[PDB]
């Protein structure tokens, strides 16, 4: 039964959902653009994620 | 295209574009009224879809 | 058609879909307006009620900034969904002919660059509150089978 | 010089103390917009004088009487100097105030019951064909070993 | 054409006037360098004169406000994450235990280990 249940909808899900999936694994890296206000607001920031 | 990428997650910041204006003009004040009635009226969000 | 949904009885949130363009939105006001019984509320507690008592049937529409809040309330039963519906924001107000309202609007921009309105929003909306943190994946990624049935 | 601060009891906004009646002055509140203003006039350097709106009304124009109330009849009468509270930013009340850019925005979501995993135990085994299909079951596979024997 | 200038057509209709939709010509948005404190881009072409309004997303900032004046922000945005469509990957070997259970295939071998004892104590044990 459960074995017909994954073959039959078969529904791909996302493994990063939040701002907070970026932290809490270390496999898949993530970048910015190298100059720009985005860099400004991810240097000047105070918290801590 | 290709259709290959996808955007989850909330805004992490509050950014926003508006209209720009040199200072001393005296156009800023229709043009924000303008700006506010294109935003009530909904046609923002229907240029948006 | 099944789960129904409603908004406050008076405010700016039935202008805005009464006066909508788009036809869902409008084939949504043509529901709520023509329900049986009325969807609409008095107050925000009210809709809490109709909300709480249906378990799952029915949904209410608000502001987003609210719904974050009670959100983070006591008994943690509530979640928030999609989407902005519409571009609203808050600012600081001061009459016509003011001299101060040009350096209050400079601080503000101030206080939006340096990052401080979002500390106070952690602050005043995760910290504050009384439930957990913001990541609810505590079984909420069951891949197979609940272990219930095998137990 | 002095300045007036309206505002209007809302949550998690404008809340009440604890020891609200042990506290004095405008530090008799606590909120968001409580440290708002002060990070206001912290970065810009005044006094000012924390007030509760009368009337419970946060801004309309009466077309009959062509008369606003709450803090927006406030400010245009005169009656305060700088509204700190999430006043809605309309069309209608650019014409009358002012307004600064908008420090928070937000939209229109959609409140649910949130359903929690409610998965039950040994009364979820039993859920997919019946619980009285299978008593007929055994009773006749004690029938049949009836007949068997 | 596209979004900006159906933008500008509608502030033409809800205000009156006429418009000239011209080109930056260095192509930037705007920046004040450190020494000559010059502004580029449509920032410096508003500073300087070069044109009379911008109808472009630019970033309302505070440097940018000590030069010039903002409306209010007609549509709001954040700092988003760009990931690819997560599409079938190989599973591999991981599937043969893959549906039902992690865990509870261990607790099946222990409960047949367990029921084996079970029956050697029964079947061997009668005289
Ligand atoms: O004033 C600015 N306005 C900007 C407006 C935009 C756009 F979204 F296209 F309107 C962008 N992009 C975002 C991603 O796609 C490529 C270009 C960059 C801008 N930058 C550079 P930043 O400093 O890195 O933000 C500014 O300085
Ligand atoms: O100017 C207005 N500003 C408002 C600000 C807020 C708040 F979010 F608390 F800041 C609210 N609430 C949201 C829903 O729960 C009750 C309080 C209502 C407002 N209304 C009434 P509307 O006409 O229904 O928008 C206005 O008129």
């Not at chain 1, 653009?33 to 607001?41: A, I, Q, R």
């Not at chain 3, 400079?106 to 504050?128: H, I, M, P």
């Amino acid at each position: 039964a459960n074995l017909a249940a994954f073959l039959t909808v078969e529904r791909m899900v996302s493994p990063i959902e939040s701002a907070e999936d970026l932290s809490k694994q270390t496999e898949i890296a993530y970048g910015t653009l190298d100059s720009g206000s985005t860099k400004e607001f991810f240097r000047r920031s105070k918290i801590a994620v | 295209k290709p259709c290959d990428t996808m955007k989850v997650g909330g805004n992490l910041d509050s950014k926003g574009y508006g209209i720009a204006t040199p200072k001393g003009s005296s156009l800023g004040a229709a043009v924000n009224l303008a700006v506010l009635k294109l935003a009530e009226q909904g046609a923002l969000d229907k240029l948006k879809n | 058609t099944e789960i129904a949904y409603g908004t406050l009885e008076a405010g700016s949130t039935k202008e805005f879909f009464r006066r909508s363009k788009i036809a869902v939105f409008e084939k949504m006001w043509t529901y709520m307006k023509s329900a049986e019984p009325s969807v609409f509320v008095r107050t925000t507690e009210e809709g809490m009620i109709r909300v709480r008592k249906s378990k799952g049937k029915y949904a209410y529409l608000l502001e987003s900034t609210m719904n974050e809040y009670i959100e983070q309330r006591k008994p943690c039963d509530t979640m928030k969904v999609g989407g902005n519906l519409d571009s609203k924001g808050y600012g600081i107000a001061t009459p016509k002919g003011s001299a101060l309202g040009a350096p209050v609007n400079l601080a503000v921009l101030k206080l939006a660059e340096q990052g401080a309105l979002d500390k106070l929003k952690a602050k005043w909306w995760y910290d504050k509150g009384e439930c957990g943190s913001k990541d609810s994946g505590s079984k909420d990624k069951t891949s197979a089978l609940s272990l219930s049935n095998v137990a | 010089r002095t300045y007036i601060v309206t505002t209007i009891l809302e949550d998690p906004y404008v809340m009440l103390k604890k020891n609200a009646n042990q506290f004095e002055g405008n530090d008799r509140y606590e909120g968001y917009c409580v440290e708002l203003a002060a990070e206001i006039a912290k970065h810009v350097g005044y006094s000012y004088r924390l007030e509760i709106v009368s009337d419970g009304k946060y801004g309309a124009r009466d077309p009959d009487t062509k008369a606003w109330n709450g803090m927006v009849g406030e400010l245009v009468y005169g009656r305060a100097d700088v509204a700190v509270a999430p006043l809605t930013i309309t069309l209608v009340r650019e014409e009358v105030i002012d307004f600064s850019k908008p420090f928070m925005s937000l939209g229109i979501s959609i409140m649910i019951k949130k359903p929690q995993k409610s998965k039950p135990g040994v009364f979820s085994f039993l859920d997919p064909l019946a619980y009285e299909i299978w008593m007929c079951i055994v009773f006749a596979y004690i029938g049949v070993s009836v007949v068997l024997f | 054409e596209g979004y900006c200038v159906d933008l500008a057509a509608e502030i033409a209709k809800h205000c009156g006037f006429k418009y000239k939709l011209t080109i930056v010509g260095d192509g930037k948005y705007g920046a004040r360098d450190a020494d000559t404190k010059i502004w580029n881009g449509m920032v410096g072409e508003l500073v300087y004169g070069k044109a009379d309004i911008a109808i472009a997303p630019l970033t309302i900032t505070l440097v940018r406000e000590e030069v010039i004046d903002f409306s209010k922000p007609f549509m709001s945005l954040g700092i988003s994450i760009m990931i690819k469509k997560p599409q079938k990957s190989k599973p591999g070997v991981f599937s043969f235990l893959d549906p039902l259970a992690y865990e509870i295939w261990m607790c099946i071998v222990f409960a047949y280990i367990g029921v084996s004892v079970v029956l050697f104590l029964v079947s061997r044990f009668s005289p």
